[PDB]
Amino acid sequence: KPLKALDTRFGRKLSIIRGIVEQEIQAMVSKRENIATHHLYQAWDPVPSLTTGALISHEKLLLQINPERELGSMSYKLGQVSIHSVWLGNSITPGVDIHSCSQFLLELYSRWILTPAILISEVVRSLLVVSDLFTERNQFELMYVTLTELRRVHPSEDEILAQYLVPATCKAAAVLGMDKAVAEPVSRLLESTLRSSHLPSRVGALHGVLYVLECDLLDDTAKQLIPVISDYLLSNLKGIAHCVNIHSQQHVLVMCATAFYLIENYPLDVGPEFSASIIQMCGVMLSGSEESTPSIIYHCALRGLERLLLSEQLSRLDAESLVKLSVDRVNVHSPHRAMAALGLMLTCMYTGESVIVAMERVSVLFDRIRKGFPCEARVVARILPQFLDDFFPPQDIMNKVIGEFLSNQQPYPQFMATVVYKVFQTLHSTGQSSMVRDWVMLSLSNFTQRAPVAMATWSLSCFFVSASTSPWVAAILPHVISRMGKLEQVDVNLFCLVATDFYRHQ
Amino acid sequence: QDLISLSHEPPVQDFISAVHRNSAASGLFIQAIQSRCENLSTPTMLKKTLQCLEGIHLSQSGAVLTLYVDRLLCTPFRVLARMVDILACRRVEMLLAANLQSSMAQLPMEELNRIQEYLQSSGLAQRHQRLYSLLDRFRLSTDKDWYVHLVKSQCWTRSDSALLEGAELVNRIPAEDMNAFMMNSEFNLSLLAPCLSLGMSEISGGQKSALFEAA
Amino acid sequence: AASCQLLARDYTGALAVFTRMQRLAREHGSALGAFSDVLVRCEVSRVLLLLLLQPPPAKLLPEHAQTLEKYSLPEELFLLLQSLVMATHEKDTEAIKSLQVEMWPLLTAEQNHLLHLVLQETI
């Protein structure tokens, strides 16, 4: 669902900053199957509005995309149509005519079920795949009846039929009301199929668990057959804790997705030790080397962890554990993993002595400005002005900006000069502009000691164009940062102009 | 071409070093290079013609100054330009270290005027400082409309590499006069795509832009 | 693996794999044969990846420092790689255009993708 933590006076800025972060994550990480061209601003999610409506922009659905899906990958992956959409698109709650084609298909497959085993397997797989298009409750009734008849007639020693049959029976049960005569054979079926040896049988059974656990207010006796799944999740997170490259990829991914769903929407049904052990095992999962845990597993588990953080359900000690794990994975070296962990620390500093903690983590972000590939530093220089402007009062951020712009262990003060410009013009309230003038005088007393000469005159020129008057001196600042080095008589002319313009600014 | 093209072989390399010990033979060598300059444009052939012109007779070195300015320095291969510049600065150093009677009677004044007019008329003198400084010391041995003029200085040109900062300079144009300052005689069409992208970034966040409408 | 990572746009992983390939080719080539082909492919593609993403000197390992000191393999493509490093350090776009026109037959399609990306993200 769309979150509770957004739509506030505080949450909108958080959505802006994480929109920038996830926007260039999807520039770096994502898989351009939607996209043909090469452009930067191509993020696009085909989620429609919901009698269909228009298409929802990508900045509005911030964490709506399920953790079962690779970043920006487009393929059928068993979670296309939610039963939210089944219940509220077609009004059933317990221009091609697609409906007639679906009725004719139910007639055909109900007559072929009631033929070799290969056709029966492909027909049940067909029925589960075409099952996104059914617009009537009677169609799901006929679906569930024919599938229970196939379960009674066809023998049990055919696990390929089982791995194509279990999500179909679970979704046909999930669209219907989950009554006891339906809930007993479905839960018995899931408890039987989770013990099998065929691995996409487990995958299909666990997607079927996700369909059953999805939206129906569920029976009090049937929710007591949940902790079989919880014991399964505990055992297969403890087993795949250390090594992820050995076991599998989609099993762990869908399995962590339903684990995060069980933490989010059904808290009280399972103990808090379960959610604590999932946060511990995923902290182990993020802390692997670049060849142990793959990028898709890393980003999906990470996105699920901040999904759980933006929910108001978790306790504060697990939130602090996620804060510590998020910092210690901000300190990783790969740029996109560092960007994802930067998104973690953003969402960690937003759902909540703390001033010294803010000093420490902002120093972490400046250390990730110093070391770090230039796209990562572009993202942090886009974030950091309004970040410092809206966290904590400007004296400490101004000491940090002055002390860490003039370092000789700065690889380039280019993007940091853009940061200085945006911080100064977000600190131009009038009584704060007097404080701005005082910081400019103190910083000039620090500027009088020499850097290399062309570099010093360029940094002074950027500082005078940065903190200046309103109308036309500030607009020169891209051109001022167009030439980084390369002292020139034009540079001396413009430095003298902006310096004499600030001499009368006081 | 076959003489230079085999220069890694010991008989012809010793031949080339035997050319450097004769004045008129090296002068005929550099005239032979000036006659066939057009087919020496591939990187390996120019690298061999720069390895063969590295050390010649110290008089005729003045003449190779001309060949380092007129012909070989305009190549887009940047290490070839750099190596022509290293060799030419070396020649001007070894020309200044010699006698003035031997150097002034060799290198003409109007020919040096032609060389420096070619350096200043092209953009090559702004590229490499040492060559023009050594030639000059050889000669010495013997705020609204202002911002509009600024954006005229850094957008109305042949071509640039700073395209983002160019569109940001186009951004805070007063926006009542964009087509007067975009639809002009010689406006850059490579700055015109970042104008579109930054206008889209201004539209998709908030209030509409005049950059995207103008572009 | 490095070709797969250049397909999936993980360029820093491609730097790590390419330096590992060059180190394991120097430990076992002292080259012999196809170890020299491994070395040629690595010595071209690491330079293209160091020009694509330009690292700060903190994360710039000394192997990257040695090869960027070496340039700033046959003679034509070596000369054009030296000229293209000198052109991207000077940011001279017309020279990089006239190099992409004349480095297109000399490179394979993965190096042509990397040289296209280098020419793109400097303009």
SS (H, E, C) A12-48: HHHHHHHHHHHHHHHHHCCCCCCCCCCCCCCCCCCCE
CA atoms of B85 and B79, how far apart (whole Å): 9
CB-based contact A475:B172 (threshold 8 Å):
yes
Chosen from A472, A480, A486 to mutate, greatest number of chain B CBs within 10 A:
A472
Cα A141 to the center of its chain, rounded Å: 36
> Given 3-state DSSP classes, what are the helix, strand and coil percentages for chain A, each rounded to the nearest 5?
65, 0, 35
* Spatial contact of A326 and A345, defined as CB atoms under 8 Å apart: yes
Q: What is the DSSP string of A383-425?
A: HHHHHHHHHS-HHHHHHHHHHHHS-TT-S-SHHHHHHHHHHHH
CB contact under 8 A, B165 and A482: yes
Q: How far apart are CA B158 and CA B153, in angstroms?
A: 11
Distance CA B134, CA B129 (A): 9
Neighbours of A10 (CB within 10 A): 10
C12–A375: do the CB atoms touch at under 8 Å?
A: no
- Residue B106, min C-alpha distance to chain C (Å): 34
Contact residues, C window 17-76, toward A, CB-based 8 Å cutoff = 53-59
Shortest CA distance to A328 belongs to which of A375, A360, A354? A360
CB proximity list for B176: less than 8 A, separation 6 or greater:
none
Q: How would you label A163-198 residue by residue, b for 16+ Cβ within 10 Å and e otherwise?
A: bbbbbbbbbbbbbbebeeebbeebbebbeebbeeee
3-state secondary structure of A55: strand
* Whether C94 and B78 lie within 8 Å, measured CB to CB: no
CA C20, chain centre distance (Å): 14
> How far is CA A288 from each of CA A133, A284, A319, A328, A329, rounded to the nearest angstrom?
41, 7, 21, 12, 10
Provide φ and ψ at A55, rounded to 5°. -100, 135
Sign of CA dihedral C92, C97, C101, C105: positive
In contact, A312 and A297? CB cutoff 8 Å: no
Instruction: Name the residue in chain C with its Cα closest to that of B45.
Output: C76
Q: How far apart are CA A337 and CA A326, in angstroms?
A: 11
Residue B84 makes CB contacts below 8 A (sequence gap 6+) with B50, B68, B72, B73, B75
Residue of A407, A411, A374, A405 whose CA lies nearest to A467:
A405
Give the pair of three-digit tokens for residue B193.
């795509």
Closest CA to A314 of A352, A257, A255, A264: A264
Nearest to A160 by CA among A123, A121, A199: A121
Terminal Cα-to-Cα distance of chain A (whole angstroms): 54
DSSP C91: T
CB A218 within 8 A of CB A178: yes
Chain A residues with at least one Cβ partner in C under 8 Å:
28, 31, 38, 290, 295, 333-336, 370-375, 411-412
Q: Which residue's entry shows tokens 């989770």? A: A194
Sequence-distant (≥ 6) Cβ neighbours of residue A272 within 8 angstroms: A315
- Reduce the DSSP state of residue A349 to 3 states and report it: coil
> Based on the number of CB atoms within 10 Å of its own CB, is B124 exposed (0-12), middle (13-18) or buried (19 or more)?
middle
Chains touching B (at least 3 CB pairs under 8 A) are A, C
Q: Report chain B residues whose CB lies below 8 A from the CB of A475.
A: 147, 169, 171-172
Look at phi and psi of residue A52 and say left if phi exceeds 0, alpha if psi is from -120 to 50, else beta.
Answer: beta
> In the 8-state DSSP scheme, what is residue A435?
H
Query: What is the b/e burial string over B26-47, where b = at least 16 CB atoms within 10 angstroms of the residue's CB?
Result: bbebbeebeeeeeebeebeebb
Angle at C121 between CA C116 and CA C123, to 5 degrees: 100
Distance CA A370, CA A351 (A): 27
CA-CA distance, A214 to B71, in Å (whole number)? 77
Range A29-58 burial, b when 16+ CB lie within 10 A, else e: bbbbeeeeeeeeebbebeeeeeeeeeeeeb
CA distance C18 to chain B (A): 26
Query: What is the C-alpha to C-alpha distance for residues B161 and B190, in angstroms, rounded to an integer?
Result: 9
Residue of B nearest to C93 (CA): B161
Chains in contact with chain C (at least 3 beta-carbon pairs closer than 8 A) = A, B
| Residue B80 sits at the chain C interface (C-beta within 8 Å) | yes
Alpha-helical regions (H) of A56-158:
83-89, 98-113, 117-130, 137-153
Q: Which residues pair with A48 in a beta bridge?
A: A55
d(CA A500, CA A503): 5
Residues 138-167 of A with CB under 8 A from B: none
Distance CA A177, CA A187 (A): 14
**Rounded (5°) CA angle B157-B162-B165:** 105
Both structure tokens of B127: 């590229």
CA C17 to CA A67: how far, in whole Å? 29
Residue written as tokens 């050319």? B19
Looking at the partner chain, which of B42, B76, B163 has a beta carbon nearest the beta carbon of C95? B76
A106 three-class SS = helix
Could you give the angle at the alpha carbon of C119 between the alpha carbons of B211 and B68, nearest 5°? 115
Contacts of C83 in chain B (CB under 8 A): 43, 76-80
Residues with Cβ within 8 Å of A445's Cβ and at least 6 positions away in sequence, in order, are none
Q: Shortest CB distance from B143 goes to which of A40, A41, A472?
A: A472
- For A102, other C-beta atoms within 10 Å of its C-beta total 18
Q: Using an 8 Å Cβ cutoff, are C12 and A373 in contact?
A: yes
What are the C-alpha distances in Å from A477 to residues A430, A495, B161?
22, 12, 17
Looking at residue B93, its amino acid is E
Q: Quick check: A485 contacting B, CB < 8 Å?
A: no
Q: Which amino acid is at A317?
A: L
List the one residue out of A261, A254, A227 whose CA is nearest residue A240: A254
**Is the CB of residue A204 less than 8 Å from the CB of residue A167?**
yes
Are A436 and A505 spatial neighbours (Cβ–Cβ below 8 Å)?
no
Q: Which long-range contacts does C72-75 make (Cβ < 8 Å, 24+ apart)?
A: C73/C40, C73/C43, C73/C44, C75/B43, C75/B44, C75/B47
Contact A297, A244 (CB under 8 A): yes
Please indicate whether, in this complex, the C-beta atoms of A479 and B150 are within 8 angstroms of each other: yes
* Cβ–Cβ < 8 Å for A78, A93: no
Name every residue whose Cβ is closer than 8 Å to that of residue A205 and which is 6 or more positions away in sequence.
A163, A166, A167, A190, A193, A194, A196
A333/C59 CB distance under 8 A: yes
Helix axes A295-310, A316-330, angle to 10 degrees: 140
Joined together, the tokens standing for residue A12 give 């909108």
Place of tokens 């101004």: A398
- Pair B5, B48: CB distance under 8 Å: yes
B166 to chain A: which residues are within 8 Å by CB?
478
Of B34, B38, B39, B41, nearest to B65 by C-alpha is: B34
Cβ partners under 8 Å of residue B71, min gap 6? B34, B37
Residue B212 · residue B182 · CB < 8 Å: no
Distance CA B52, CA B126 (A): 28
Distance CA B6, CA A311 (A): 76
CA distances from B38 to A405, B32, B41, B42, C77 (A): 51, 12, 6, 10, 21
Is B165 at the interface with chain A, CB within 8 A? yes
Partners of A55 in beta bridges: A48
Nearest Cα of chain C lies from the Cα of B111 at a distance, in angstroms, of 29
Contact C22, C63 (CB under 8 A): yes
Using a CB–CB cutoff of 8 Å, tell me whether B50 touches chain C: no
Q: Do B150 and A478 touch (CB under 8 A)?
A: no
Q: Which of A84, A49, A4, A47 is nearest to A307 (CA)?
A: A4
Nearest to A370 among C13, C55, C58 (CB): C58
**Residue where the block lists tokens 């087509």:** B179
Residue from C4, C11, C12 to probe the interface with A (highest A Cβ count within 10 Å):
C12
**Helix crossing, B23-35 with B61-70: angle to 10°?**
10
| Backbone phi, psi, residue A404, to 5° | -125, 15
3-state secondary structure of A227: helix
Distance CA(A94)–CA(A141), nearest Å, equals: 13
Experimental approach taken: cryo-EM
d(CA B128, CA C82): 18
C12 to chain A: which residues are within 8 Å by CB? 334-335, 373
A216 by Cβ neighbours in 10 Å (0-12 / 13-18 / 19+) ranks as buried
Round to whole Å and give the CA distance between A13 and A92.
38
Neighbours of chain A (3+ CB pairs under 8 A): B, C
Residue of A169, A171, A115, A177 lying closest to A146 (CA atoms): A169
Shortest distance between the Cα of B206 and any Cα of chain A, in A, equals 12
Given B143, B197, B200, which is nearest A473 (Cβ)? B143
- Residue B55: CA atoms inside 13 Å, Cβ hemisphere, count? 4
Q: Hey, is the C-beta of A41 within 8 angstroms of any chain B C-beta?
A: yes
Tell me how far apart the alpha carbons of residues C44 and A143 are, in angstroms, rounded to a whole number: 59
**Using CA atoms, how far apart are residues A139 and A303, in angstroms rounded to an integer?**
36
Residue of A73, A371, A375 to mutate, interface with C, max C Cβ within 10 Å:
A371
Do A380 and A368 contact (CB within 8 A), yes or no?
Answer: yes
Side-chain-side CA neighbours of residue A433 (13 Å): 12
C16 touches chain A (CB under 8 A): yes
Burial class, A471, CB count within 10 angstroms (exposed 0-12 / middle 13-18 / buried 19+): exposed
Cα–Cα distance, B133 to A407 (Å, whole number): 33
User: What token pair was written down for A255?
Assistant: 């399995």
Distance separating alpha carbons of residues A118 and A161, to the nearest angstrom? 9
Rounded CA-CA distance A350/A12 in Å is 11
B150–A476 C-beta distance less than 8 A: yes
Question: DSSP secondary-structure letter at A79?
Answer: -
Site of tokens 């070391």:
A371
**Is residue A452 classed exposed, middle or buried when 0-12, 13-18 and 19+ CB atoms within 10 A define those classes?**
exposed
Q: Are C12 and A334 a contacting pair, CB within 8 Å?
A: yes
Q: Exposed, middle or buried, A263 (CB in 10 Å: 0-12/13-18/19+)?
A: buried
**3-state percent breakdown (helix, strand, coil) of chain B, nearest 5:** 65, 0, 35
